[PDB]
Amino acid sequence: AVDPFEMVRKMGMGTNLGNTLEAPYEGSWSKSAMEYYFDDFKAAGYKNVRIPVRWDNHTMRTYPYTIDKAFLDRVEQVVDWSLSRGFVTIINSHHDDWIKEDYNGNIERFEKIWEQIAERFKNKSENLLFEIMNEPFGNITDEQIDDMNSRILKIIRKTNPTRIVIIGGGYWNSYNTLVNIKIPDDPYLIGTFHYYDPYETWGTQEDMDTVVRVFDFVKSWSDRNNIPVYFGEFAVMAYADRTSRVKWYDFISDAALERGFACSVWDNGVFDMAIYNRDTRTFDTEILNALF
Structure with missing residues (x-):
């Protein structure tokens, strides 16, 4: 398969779809994802799109911690728009702070979320990357950060x-x-x-x-x-x-x-x-010029 160095070269300069799927509910912050955003991102010159996602309110709070199918459906739709336009596409966990509030208590829920993401997106193009967690640093020890990375990686590797x-x-x-x-x-x-x-x-x-x-x-x-x-x-x-x-x-x-x-x-x-x-549907073209 493509190695990380080749992937990073291909990724170049890209954009976040910020304040959208990582809002508590899509559309409650900035405008919901639309297919044409990606047409515009491509025309703009972006080579990647990071898509922050907060899984919290689309996932059961109790065992077995199932992600609503419709939300998985929705994230797949947006991902497929990005992938089909040639973008290296990044999905993550973002603003899922509940896991830092109680690592021991919440690690299983986080595991099952990633178990389900990994499962759903297993066949997606190499261009879809998994970012385990947006800001691993903060109200959580180094030991717990390392522990999280190891076990989420291992879960991911079972299907990916x-x-x-x-x-x-x-x-x-x-x-x-x-x-x-x-x-x-x-x-x-x-x-x-x-x-x-x-x-x-x-x-x-x-x-x-x-x-x-x-x-x-x-x-x-x-x-x-x-x-x-x-x-x-x-x-x-x-x-x-x-x-x-x-x-x-x-x-x-x-x-x-x-x-x-x-x-x-x-x-x-x-x-x-x-x-x-x-x-x-316009860009601040002076900033775009500054980026390329």
Whole structure:
């Protein structure tokens, strides 16, 4: 099968379908997924689409933790729109915070959710990737993070033996960068990094120097561990003025793609932090130009 390095090269620069299927219920935040979004994403030049999904309210809270068939149907529909247009397509668990609130108590429910996702999408193209969990870091120990990754990977591998899986490689903020040392012995892994600050504006000259340093350290990590890197939601901060914002998109893309990283820009569909207008079907073309 296609190895993670080939996949990351193919992924290039892409977009999130933010604030949609990872809302508590689809459409309750930003506009629901429509097929034409993907026509527009393709015409825009995007090479991947990350599709955040919150499984919580579409899954039984009690055993056997079945995901509503209609929701699985709906996610498959959206996935099939993305895959058929040639996008590398990423699905995940996103905003399923209930698992961090009680790991021991909720790990079985999380396992069964992934058991069902893996089962449903087992025959999908190599271009569909599984991202185990959006932000593994936070109210949960390292031991539990490593435990989660191991067992969800193993569950995935039962039905998806070579499908590339995205796990948290670590995180970064203005003060430090953390990287995982314990990486499962598996040949089909991509490592992902998000902004995270345990003690929780942007676009200055200093902010850029910070990001290059982060990117360089992540690159060393990438080289040393033989794992390619994916920044699945960059440009999540708010910006001082228009000119900073555009420059920042331009800078992140250059720096990432020079180091061979795959990227998905955060786009929440709000006109806040949006590039694609889902109502007018237009893009902020200056930001797109900055991305390509």
